[PDB]
Ligand binder design. Structure first.
Ligand code: A8S
Ligand code: MG
Ligand code: MG
Lengths: 158, 312
């Protein structure tokens, strides 16, 4: 998780403790073609072919947001080291050159096997805003995503 | 008893997330909230025992899904009707009271109660008894506006939460009965920022850069910045009154208050000149007209219009 933000960019990260085993969480994160598995803001997602470096998904988001669609490319997918990197390359949103890195790590939580998820990003600051506003916008969405990921994961343990 | 019309369409959008409710004689309004007990005791009339029927009308623009708007359609009038009957009894062993402040409480605690059911903070009753549910109605990113008008022969009581709107045409000139909860409103920014939140300009002024309104039902992932507290206004009726217009942003984004009033009066009169829980043909014709006027003007959102005739 080392990003180098340029002068016209910002960067931050969010983390979440999940009471589920790593293999269980990562089985959800890796399905790059179905982010609606844990992202509450996705309504539709299309993708042709196998999940591989260079894969492109076309995402459509639900109503009540500042955007409707983004095009996202899979940059990194490591199944031994649990890493996932995605880049936004299109859409009608204001997150230009968005790039995120997400990793899953094992951990003991309340005497049972658990999971720590860490997600960082860098993105251009859009015209008119500040580094702080942009980070706030993204962290709010990511915190919500990792919130959802934890719920679905902890539900599959039962 | 009540004369209304309701026009509702998916519009040019893929899905329908608007909902509406029109419930005649849904409750009896405790007259103790409209007039003092002393003023009525001077006539020999017991304010606590006086029966006055009321009707409920509501428009709920959903976002992130239709489930919360639909839930509002199904629950607000029921929760509200029960609160009014309970309040009617508690006024028995009570004295005089501030009517403004009691209308605020009953609508606030009502919206707060539906929000608490939607989020799971309280258990709720399904299947009319026997069943109970305690899990949230839906995901934490689904919400809905709520603009409701309680109507009786002497008063209109209005409760607004979100960017839907209700407009009264009194004297052929429009009167806004609600003020949109846009997050850049001076007092809403102050409220949100005092809470530790941000109102960001991000394709419009948005809470946390996400939601284009400062109040709504649901949306627990944006709390405590987005809140379900409604603005309540009690509007005594008058001989000037023309009609009531409740609508989602699907109409107000492309039609002004002035224009919506002018078209409503004309369509109701227009229908009466040509012709010397069911809807009234004239109000309906004004509702269908306003809906199509929104489509003909290039509105891409869901569109919901309720017109209430305040004269015959
Ligand atoms: C929720 C949403 C709204 C937007 O305005 C942009 C975009 C459509 C890209 C997005 O899907 C952004 C999602 C983000 C930041 C992270 C993710 O999804 O992991
Ligand atoms: Mg909507
Ligand atoms: Mg809408």
């Amino acid at each position: 998780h080392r990003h180098e933000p340029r002068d016209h960019q910002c960067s931050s990260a969010v983390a979440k403790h999940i009471k589920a085993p790593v293999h269980l969480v990562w089985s959800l994160v890796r399905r790059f073609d179905q982010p609606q598995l844990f992202k509450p803001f996705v309504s539709r997602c299309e993708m042709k072919g196998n999940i591989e470096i260079g894969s492109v998904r076309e995402v459509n988001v639900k109503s009540g947001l500042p955007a409707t669609r983004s095009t996202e490319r899979l940059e990194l997918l490591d199944d031994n080291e649990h890493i996932l990197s995605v880049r936004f390359v299109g859409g009608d949103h204001r997150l230009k050159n968005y790039s995120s890195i997400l990793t899953v790590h094992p951990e003991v939580i309340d005497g049972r096997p658990g999971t720590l998820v860490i997600e960082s990003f860098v993105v251009d600051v859009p015209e008119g805003n500040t580094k702080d506003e942009t980070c706030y916008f993204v962290e709010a969405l990511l915190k919500c995503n990792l919130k959802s990921l934890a719920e679905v994961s902890e539900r599959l343990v039962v | 008893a009540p004369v209304w019309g309701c026009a509702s369409t998916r519009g040019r959008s893929a899905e329908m997330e608007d909902a509406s409710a029109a419930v005649p004689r849904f409750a009896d309004v405790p007259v103790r909230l409209l007039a003092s007990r002393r003023d009525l005791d001077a006539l020999g009339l017991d304010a606590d025992a006086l029966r006055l029927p009321a009707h409920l009308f509501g428009v709920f623009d959903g976002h992130g899904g239709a489930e919360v708007a639909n839930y509002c359609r199904e629950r607000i009038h029921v929760v509200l009707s029960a609160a009014l009957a309970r309040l009617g009894k508690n006024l028995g062993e009570m004295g005089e009271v501030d009517m403004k402040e009691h209308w605020d409480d009953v609508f606030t605690k009502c919206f707060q109660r539906v929000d608490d059911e939607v989020s799971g903070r309280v258990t709720r009753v399904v299947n009319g008894g026997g069943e109970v549910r305690s899990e949230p109605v839906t995901a934490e990113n689904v919400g809905s506006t709520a603009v409701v008008a309680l109507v009786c022969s002497s008063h209109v009581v209005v409760a607004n939460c979100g960017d839907s709107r209700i407009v009264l045409c009194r004297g052929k000139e429009p009167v806004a009965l609600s003020i949109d909860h846009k997050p850049d409103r001076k007092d809403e920014r102050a409220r949100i920022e005092a809470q530790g939140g941000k109102v960001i300009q991000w394709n419009g002024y948005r809470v946390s850069g996400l939601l284009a309104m400062s109040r709504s039902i649901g949306d627990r992932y944006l709390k405590p910045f987005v809140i379900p507290k409604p603005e309540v206004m009690v509007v005594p009726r008058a001989k000037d009154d023309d009609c009531l217009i409740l609508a989602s942003d699907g109409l107000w984004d492309v039609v002004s208050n002035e224009e919506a009033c002018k078209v409503a009066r004309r369509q109701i009169l227009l229908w009466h000149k040509n012709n010397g829980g069911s809807t009234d043909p004239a109000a309906q014709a004004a509702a269908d007209y306003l809906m199509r006027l929104a489509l003909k003007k290039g509105s891409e959102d869901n569109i919901t219009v309720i017109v209430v005739d305040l004269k015959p």
